[PDB]
Amino acid sequence: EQIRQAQEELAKIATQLNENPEEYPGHFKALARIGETPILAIQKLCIVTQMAVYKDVIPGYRIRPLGEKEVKRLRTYEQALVAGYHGYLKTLATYAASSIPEDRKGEPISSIAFTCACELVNAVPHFNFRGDLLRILVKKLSTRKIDRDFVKCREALEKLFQDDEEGNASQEAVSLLSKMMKAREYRVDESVLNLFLHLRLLSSHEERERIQSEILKMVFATYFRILKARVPHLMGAVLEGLAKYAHLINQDFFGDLLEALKDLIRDTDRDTSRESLLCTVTAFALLEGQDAHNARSDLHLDLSFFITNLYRSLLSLSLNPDLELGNNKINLQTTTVLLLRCLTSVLLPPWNIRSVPPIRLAAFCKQLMTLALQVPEKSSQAILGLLQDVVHTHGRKVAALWNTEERKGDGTYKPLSETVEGSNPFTTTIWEGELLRKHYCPKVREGLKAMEKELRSI
Amino acid sequence: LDKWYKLAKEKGYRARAAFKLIQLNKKYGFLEKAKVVLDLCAAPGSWCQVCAETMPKDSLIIGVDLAPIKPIPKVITFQSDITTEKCRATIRSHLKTWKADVVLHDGAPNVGTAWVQDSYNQAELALHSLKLATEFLIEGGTFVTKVFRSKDYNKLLWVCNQLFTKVEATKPPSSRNVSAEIFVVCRGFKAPKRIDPRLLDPRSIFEDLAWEEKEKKSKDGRPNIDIITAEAMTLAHQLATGEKTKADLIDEGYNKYAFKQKEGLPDWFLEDEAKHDKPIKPITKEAAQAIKEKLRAL
Amino acid sequence: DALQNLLDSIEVPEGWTGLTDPNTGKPLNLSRDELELIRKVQQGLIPDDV
Amino acid sequence: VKMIRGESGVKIAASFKSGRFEKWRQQHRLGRLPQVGEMEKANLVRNFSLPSGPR
RNA sequence: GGGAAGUCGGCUCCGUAACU
């Protein structure tokens, strides 16, 4: 058989080039001629074979072009390495650029060469022409099609972002991902935005600091034009991406991100309920940064503008029934948990848990009773299951509302106020707990007794 | 005498085999978190000098060689043959209850007899280091071995795939380009509870394999009436304000370039005429601001 | 009207000049005959009819 | 400058970085220490473990 | 290395037998 004969010469090439790769550059050329004959079974068997050959022969250091006994013997083998390995890539580039579908018996040329390229790019890094191997990966990630080879390249790239200590391959990757979407028009499936998240270098010193300085500046400029682009699903990953990596860059630029999202609040105030809530747990996460809370005395990062935005929008969030839809901090889709992670961070901060203003406790719990009226069932228990924890931690500071002897008589209650301290909830007592006994007893009423039992236990 | 040999005499290193080790460790960093290094064929002590230069002043360095090594501080060296039971008992007595973190090999036979025999001697000496690595190394340890590239280098690399998770073959640039040595570094020792004797037997390993549609014409004339240039809008501003009337506009329109032919002439003749008949008229900042608002799109 | 002004800002009329009329508070708009007179003056192909 | 009392019994300034950790950090040539949150190193526990117990 | 100074300094785990 020709296939059996081609397999025999392929193994003879593979054994001789792995026993001693020096003596036979003509084996490398004949391996290219076997790799260039058009028989589909031979093309599959060849490509996997000299993929593992160049997995075994590529040295640990880079080789310069020659330009211009044993020393000349080395260089002729050295140019034979680069020219043969370079001839892999356009062959791989043409193999990648060709069509996918064929008969169902096997993956003819696309998935097998992409798997070979993904395995090759998990070892090439230190060597050159990785960008040509990367440009194949940008090309396939640009097709906007979910596939097995798509998640293979995503897993292959996220290995390099979690392995490359030098980061030069990481820098070459993110530069092409920026060139991916300045050439195109904000049309990723958000996958490269998570690929920014598995980058380890964001999470020799002078070269590494310059490598950090390049990757910090360009990739944040990528999200900077995404915020100008205003793509809704890209916002969720970007605000997730901005929440993690905001503390590295300097004081004035990091405070500019707050001013940037403040303008996004004003743009929404001109979908919009979600986008504000995507921006809501975002800015609460930046304050939740341990170095950023240590930077409470190294920056003003203040949320008293932002709670007032939530307070005036608690009515509109109660009216919308779109709350429930089909280890992440920001990128959660449903606004029920987004409201929870908001309203947890407002009445129960991680840092300074017991240092909360009183009128903020009285007003947000009173409006929580109004939220307990117009809300679906699943959002109700978690809203319920939050507010015992508010009372069990605070107690007497909010218990003035439930008891009418502890009621201040300054002025009548104004439910529609522009400021949290504008309403005076110490005058009104809470009766919406009675309205929730009328709500389905089996589930809602449980939390009510748990709310009142912890209230008496104080 | 090369550059690395001259740097050995300047830095006090005994040989240039030291400079292959540091630049190997600069690539990986397997010596900065280790307590024990089992140095096999450590002559003249250059690899012990690197291992002494990088660890804790409370960690253990054991060097084994067939030749007597001069004493090095913080390094314990003794003379024994690495394939003997007395050697592994001496290492065990030195190690006591402590397992090796890194196992190094700088083995090289007396080359000069035959290239095939020297490579086979180097390949088996790397294998005598390979079983010595297996019971002394701690889990997750490092195994670095110098070996010549030869026919059995495939076989030795295959056993490294079996017993170790991550294995690389690398040429230090500090090594000789003429020399056919290659350095294989193995990481992640899998800790098997049973090791195949044929996986540790030189005779077995080195065996050779064998309706309404009437439309009026108004959407095309209107772009031709729409103002484009600033001079026309200045005339439009002068017409809108009570300054110039219809008679003044016709009279000002009667320039020197009137009563001309513009229909029956070729394209190139009228293009040159259109480029060279433009009059200069005064403009205003109000017209310039208004034409900027007109040209400003969404 | 606010909707009429918003529609005028998105698509300006043919006679729009951005000028406030000295007679009326509404902005002054050129007539069809005035716009044809400006085009005939600028082009110069027929300044005077018949 | 806040004033405290040291082990030597001499009144030492409160925030004094003597240099022993810096000396410690090349005595065994350890790398950078973990921040709060990162995993322990199975090396770093066995490098500096406890003794058999009778001190 | 020594003397001085200051201290509060020196004077449970493996195997075996019944029970869960």
UniProtKB/Swiss-Prot annotation, chain C:
The lineage of its organism: Eukaryota, Fungi, Dikarya, Ascomycota, Pezizomycotina. The chain holds residues 202 to 251 of 801 of the full protein. It comes from the Eukaryota. Component of the NOP7 complex, which is required for maturation of the 25S and 5.8S ribosomal RNAs and formation of the 60S ribosome. Component of the NOP7 complex, composed of ERB1, NOP7 and YTM1. The complex is held together by ERB1, which interacts with NOP7 via its N-terminal domain and with YTM1 via a high-affinity interaction between the seven-bladed beta-propeller domains of the 2 proteins. The NOP7 complex associates with the 66S pre-ribosome. It is found in: Nucleus, Nucleolus; Nucleus, Nucleoplasm. This is Ribosome biogenesis protein ERB1. It comes from Chaetomium thermophilum (strain DSM 1495 / CBS 144.50 / IMI 039719). The gene is ERB1. Belongs to the WD repeat BOP1/ERB1 family.
